Paper text:
These cytoskeletal filaments are extensively decorated externally and internally by proteins required for the various beating motions and the structural integrity of flagella 3,4.
Three-dimensional classification and refinement of subtomograms corresponding to the 96 nm-repeating units were performed 19. We then performed local refinement on the 48 nm-repeating structures of doublets focusing on the microtubules, aiming to reach the highest possible resolution (see the workflow shown in Figure S1). The newly developed RELION4 was used to refine the 3D reconstructions and achieved 7.7 Å overall resolution (FSC = 0.143) 24. Inside the A-tubule of mouse sperm axonemes, twelve helical bundles form a filamentous core parallel to the longitudinal axis, whereas only eight helical bundles, identified as Tektins 1–4, are present in bovine trachea cilia 13. SPACA9 (Sperm Acrosome-Associated Protein 9) was found to be the best hit (see Data S3 for the top 30 hits). For the curved helical bundles, there are three 16-nm groups of densities within every 48-nm repeat.
Residue numbers in the entry:
A (entry chain Fw): 53 to 128
B (entry chain a): 149 to 197
C (entry chain Bn): 1 to 427
D (entry chain Bm): 1 to 439
E (entry chain B2): 1 to 36, 47 to 439
The structure:
């Protein structure tokens, strides 16, 4: 249940993608019934340790917000 | 030479106080995070009620 | 006292220019924290051409980095040398140009151009005497070509007697990577022929043939093509910072070069570019450096200049060399080849030497050629614009916010003459 | 900061959104109940979820999406399924009684009671966050609320927002494979708003996805779950350059101006090239120059129209993974070498190229494989003109005998709107002709 | 030192005081048996460690007092504070004013004397009543007239429930609600107005609850009262006083009818997903579907606003919220009030009752406004007065208990005077 153990990783990946057991909201593998509708097949299984992204390159914006708060520089 | 040495000492002092400012800002940010965790906890308690 | 300011434009310029400060700071000996730890003694003697002072003896580079998307500024700040830039000097919008030259000239970028100039007037106030500004952009996209032009025509009007210099990524002929390229490139040369004192043509297809045939690389990524341009921008202005014999500044290379004031589109090249297998095999001598300058492979623009005459030719050598081997070796070019040279200038060559080589080489040069073959990519850009504009292929994305259509057939009026002006001076 | 809002309409569009929000949740670390699962472990360098999630006060991420349906049964599988603890319960908007394969119900008489709700819930979402690159809606042509309320949503959403971009995703009827006799009557008459009020309207046929699975993959009898997983890997490739940085990145503004020549030619195609069974990915190479030659194959398109009959106006290429920029430029000039691949006489440039460093992620239980490389080839093509030529013929054949008309005309629809839609698509069969001949 | 004394008149006042004193006793540490420096505003303290409040409960039905005696707060009150009459007023202003109230008005004013001499210096009474019933109109009116003449400059706060447009129970409600105002207008130094239909719609719409009872309504009223007087009890950055916001709030000496609004009335379900910023709730309390009296503010010019923020607020954000409220071009303001607003900020968050249906909110706002929108919420009462009194129904009971026929008309011209004051102060300049 620990993806740095199974796969190598880039060490800056967050703990959500590191530990896959916390995604508790998915379906719970009900044994099949006849009244099994087909659109419910979307998102029917939780992600496992194999499907987590190896690397992650998101776009931070904290510095851009904390600089462009207010207005840009102008000589008065 | 004496004036140059005084300049170097005073500049090192001000960078020490700036490092103090950096550490207190990180402390305040972690305090805000623990406040957020506390709010999440007792909202879950109310849902259980 | 002669110092310059290094503006960076667009997202292509922020890959060039962020690699430009990791080459200058290698040369001047600055750590990523901004404190001098260097070897020699004249190395920081002319540190003030580019850099600036702060409290406590730390050096900050001067620049201004523009963009229309906030993603690039976080990427520059997380770079290897990204710590030294001032956080006030980054300026950026909130909504991207979307490869639209008209958005980046009228509606999305004009909110920003009143805020870049407040940074520029703050950096140009601090000078002893400005040698001239400097800009880095791309002639293929929207926010480099629109707003990066709108910086130029407003800086030039309010600083009229400074030596404006640019560095342009000219779009490729056919190996291209944007559908709406010729609307973006023909609408920028219309405002780049009348407002720049020198402008450099950097093909992205001659920058791959270098990286296959004379360097013999395996996976040429963008990390080193920014470096090949960033060795030429350091190489032109080495005479500005460091001493030597026959120095030639950023301005005295302009006076000798452009014979008529609309023909300032150059083609550069860097002289020792040697494969890592053949580093053992190149011979360090001045004539062997010269055959690389005039070789047709190390041309770094899109047209081979054997299809016409050079008008004026530069050569800014660097290192320790006898200046008889400099001034004889250029003469042996003008006599072995004679039909490839304009015959109403009796000497087509400007030379220069300085005594401080690049880090890790004995000697290096920087070729500059004002060839008359540069009309050829002006025809191929204009022919891919007069096929789109026969039946208005993509025009409604540009017209709908305030650009009328006559500023597109005005562009080819200011473009199809410049094809002809190289032809009447061809012979 | 660089966000998007995903508005889902109808029974087809909701079951796309069951597949997308499964797959964005796997791409970040987010569990199906929010809860970024880091527990007292330090981390730095993040905020790649601002484009599709919102970090709230409790530390729980809630996405920006409204789910609109006129049917109760489809959405209430989400309210009781695994992702019930993820969506905000005001954002699963539910209708009361359905449109039942009717433009006139979905646009004139049933969506009037519900349009006041959705335009309040969208304005709550957008006022919340800084910028807006653009909405990404999902619908279907062949149904009532999928094409009625969608035709009423887009007329109202282009007024009060305007300059913020839009996208549009469609389910387009096949030549052979149909599910309703109302299918031509509403796939002709939905174009009075997807022409005026859409900035890019992507096109996906059910029939080629029914055929691309039997030939590339070792799968037979594929159901609707396998159609949703494939189109989830397109929307997670168009928007991948917003989140995960790259050497050459295109935003939503960037490929809009490189792909539509004139403002009535916004009907591009899309293809996903390295589709391969997970047994077969062990076998072949799937190189950097292999998967770009596959984008132009007639067997691996998305709408069943022959690509060897039209001329390509523009192409945008969206690469993903470990791609070097020299190998891209070796690929493109090879395509212009071959002379059975046709480009229009006023476009020598041809291409727009994007590259992201993030590899294409895998989904558990998915028949797609794990491959280091991927590309999604966008193209605007004259061959889609021959795709309405099997729908105008199925409309006037219907309309002459006036079959199935009395339902529409009794609900506030006038008979002057039927034949007005037929000329407005027979006009567009000349707009895709007049830019075809050479000069 | 800054104390206040509460009088609860009638069944509406008794049940509002129920919800109140549960909320205050859980807000401080005090258990209901009185056993545990901020209680001195409301709680007298004995030498043992019992806390006893400054409250007087008075009703004429014995039942509405002795279920307060039977219920679990019997230990708190001195058992002589709980005062009981013999017959109820039977929805009759005249009968509650005359035939029952004279028997125990002496006892309630003597308890007022005995409690108000057990303090240092008074700040303001808080009496609770409603404008629908007999004793809660008339005995309230006699009480407030006598207390105002007897004390003079000592400020009082009357709390009132108005009869709603379509939510009503009795039939003599226009009669007693127009006959209360004539001598309950000019002796109260302030009075506040709510109605049941607005609270019903806020419970139905904002909170995810259908079908509420009077318990939830009294919980909301207790939240608003606690929001007013927490600046007395608990200290903070910008605490305002009673005299402070009276002078800031009342423009003219018969326009003393502020509204009430309390902004984050949202369940735990919506509170968990939604962020809540102070600019967001500053707009949300000026939303014209969140007020607490059914008058549309779009018909109304705002003479004055005073905001009461509680919790994790900082002043720059409240100031930016004020600027972005005046920036809008859909909210009307008075042509001779350039300043507009008054701000208070407390340092203690709202305290949550167990079993209540609210959520614990880090930043709350209680908004008060003196607006001209409320003027069109009297013409409905005057028209119902006309429809009754023209053919003269239900007058003979009130005049058999004792009156003359001209006093209702005196109340009618009093409401005409109030209508013309609210019309003339709102126009242009």
């Amino acid at each position: 249940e620990k993806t740095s153990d199974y796969y190598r990783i880039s060490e800056k990946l967050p703990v959500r993608f590191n530990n896959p057991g916390w995604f508790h909201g998915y379906g719970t593998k009900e044994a099949v019934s006849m009244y099994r509708t087909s659109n419910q097949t979307y998102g029917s299984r939780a992600p496992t340790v194999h499907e987590m992204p190896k690397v992650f390159y998101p776009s931070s914006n904290k510095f851009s917000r904390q600089h462009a708060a207010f207005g840009m520089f102008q000589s008065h | 030479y004496e004036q140059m040495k005084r300049d170097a000492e005073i500049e090192r002092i001000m960078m020490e106080e700036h490092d103090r400012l950096l550490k207190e800002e990180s402390a305040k940010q972690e305090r805000r995070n623990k406040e957020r965790a506390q709010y999440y906890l007792d909202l879950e308690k109310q849902l259980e009620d | 006292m002669r110092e310059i300011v290094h503006l960076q434009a667009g997202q292509c310029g922020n890959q060039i220019g962020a690699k430009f400060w990791e080459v200058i700071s290698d040369e001047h000996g600055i750590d990523p924290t901004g404190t001098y730890h260097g070897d020699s003694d004249l190395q920081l003697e002319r540190i003030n051409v580019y850099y600036n002072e702060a409290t406590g003896g730390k050096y900050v580079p001067r620049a201004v980095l523009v963009d229309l998307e906030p993603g690039t500024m976080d990427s520059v700040r997380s770079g290897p040398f990204g710590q030294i830039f001032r956080p006030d000097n980054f300026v950026f919008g909130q909504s991207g140009a979307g490869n639209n030259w008209a958005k980046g000239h009228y509606t999305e970028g004009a909110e920003l151009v009143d805020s870049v100039l407040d940074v520029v007037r703050k950096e140009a106030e601090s000078c002893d005497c400005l040698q001239g500004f400097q800009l880095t952009h791309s002639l293929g996209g929207g926010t480099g070509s629109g707003m990066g032009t709108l910086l130029i025509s407003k800086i030039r009007e309010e600083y009229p007697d400074r030596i404006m210099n640019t560095f342009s990524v000219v779009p490729s002929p056919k190996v291209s990577d944007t559908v709406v390229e010729p609307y973006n490139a023909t609408l920028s040369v219309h405002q780049l022929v009348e407002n720049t004192d020198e402008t450099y043509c950097i093909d992205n297809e001659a920058l791959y043939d270098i990286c296959f045939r004379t360097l013999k690389l395996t996976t040429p990524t963008y990390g080193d093509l920014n470096h090949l341009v960033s060795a030429t921008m350091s190489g032109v202005t080495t005479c500005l910072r460091f001493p030597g014999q026959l120095n030639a500044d950023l301005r005295k290379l302009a006076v000798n070069m452009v014979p008529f004031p609309r023909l300032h589109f150059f083609m550069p090249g860097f002289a020792p570019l040697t494969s890592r297998g053949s580093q053992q095999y190149r011979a360090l001598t001045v004539p062997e450096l010269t055959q690389q300058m005039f070789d047709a492979k190390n041309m770094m623009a899109a047209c081979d200049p054997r299809h016409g005459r050079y008008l004026t030719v530069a050569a800014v050598f660097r290192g320790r060399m006898s200046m008889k081997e400099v001034d004889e070796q250029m003469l042996n070019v003008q006599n072995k080849n004679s039909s490839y040279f304009v015959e109403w200038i009796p000497n087509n060559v400007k030379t220069a030497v300085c005594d401080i080589p690049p880090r890790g080489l004995k000697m290096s040069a920087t070729f500059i050629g004002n060839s008359t073959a540069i009309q050829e990519l002006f025809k191929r850009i204009s022919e891919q614009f007069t096929a789109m504009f026969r039946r208005k292929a993509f025009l409604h994305w540009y017209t709908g916010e305030g650009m009328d259509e006559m500023e597109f057939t005005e562009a080819e009026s200011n473009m199809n003459d410049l094809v002809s002006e190289y032809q009447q001076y061809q012979d | 900061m660089r966000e998007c809002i995903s508005i889902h309409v109808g029974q087809a569009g909701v079951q796309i959104g069951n597949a997308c929000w499964e797959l964005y949740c796997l791409e970040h670390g987010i569990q199906p109940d929010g809860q970024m699962p880091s527990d007292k472990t330090i981390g730095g360098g993040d905020d790649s979820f601002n484009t599709f999630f919102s970090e709230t006060g409790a530390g729980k991420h809630v996405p920006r999406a409204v789910f609109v349906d006129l049917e109760p049964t489809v959405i209430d599988e989400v309210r009781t399924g695994t992702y019930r603890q993820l969506f905000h319960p005001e954002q699963l908007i539910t209708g009361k009684e359905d449109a039942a394969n009717n433009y006139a119900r979905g646009h004139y008489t049933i969506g009037k009671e519900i349009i006041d709700l959705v335009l309040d819930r969208i304005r709550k979402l957008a006022d919340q966050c800084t910028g807006l690159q653009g909405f990404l809606v999902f619908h279907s042509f062949g149904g009532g609320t999928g094409s009625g309320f969608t035709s009423l949503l887009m007329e109202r959403l282009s007024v009060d927002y305007g300059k913020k971009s839009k996208l549009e995703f469609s389910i387009y009827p096949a030549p052979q494979v149909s599910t309703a006799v109302v299918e031509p009557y509403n796939s002709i008459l939905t174009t009075h708003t997807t022409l005026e009020h859409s900035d890019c309207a992507f096109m996906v046929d059910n029939e080629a996805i029914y055929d691309i699975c039997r030939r590339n993959l070792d799968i037979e009898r594929p159901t609707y779950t396998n159609l949703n997983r494939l189109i989830g890997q397109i929307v997670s490739s168009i928007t991948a350059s917003l989140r995960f940085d790259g050497a050459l990145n295109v935003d939503l503004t960037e490929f809009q101006t490189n792909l539509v020549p004139y403002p009535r030619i916004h009907f591009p195609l899309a293809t996903y090239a390295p589709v391969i069974s997970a047994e077969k990915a062990y076998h072949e190479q799937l190189s950097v120059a292999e998967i770009t030659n596959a984008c132009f194959e007639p067997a691996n398109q998305m709408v069943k129209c022959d690509p060897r009959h039209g001329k390509y106006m523009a192409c945008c290429l969206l690469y993903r993974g470990d791609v070097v920029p020299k190998d891209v430029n070796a690929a493109i000039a090879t395509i212009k070498t071959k002379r059975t691949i046709q480009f229009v006489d006023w476009c020598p440039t041809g291409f727009k190229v994007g590259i992201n460093y993030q590899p294409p992620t895998v989904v558990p239980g998915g028949d797609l494989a794990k491959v280091q490389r991927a590309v999604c080839m966008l193209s605007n093509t004259t061959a889609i003109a021959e795709a309405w030529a099997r729908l105008d013929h199925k409309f006037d054949l219907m309309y002459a005998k006036r079959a199935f008309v009395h339902w529409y005309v009794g609900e506030g629809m006038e008979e002057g709107e039927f034949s007005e839609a037929r000329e407005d698509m027979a006009a567009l069969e000349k707009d895709y002709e007049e830019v075809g001949v050479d000069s």
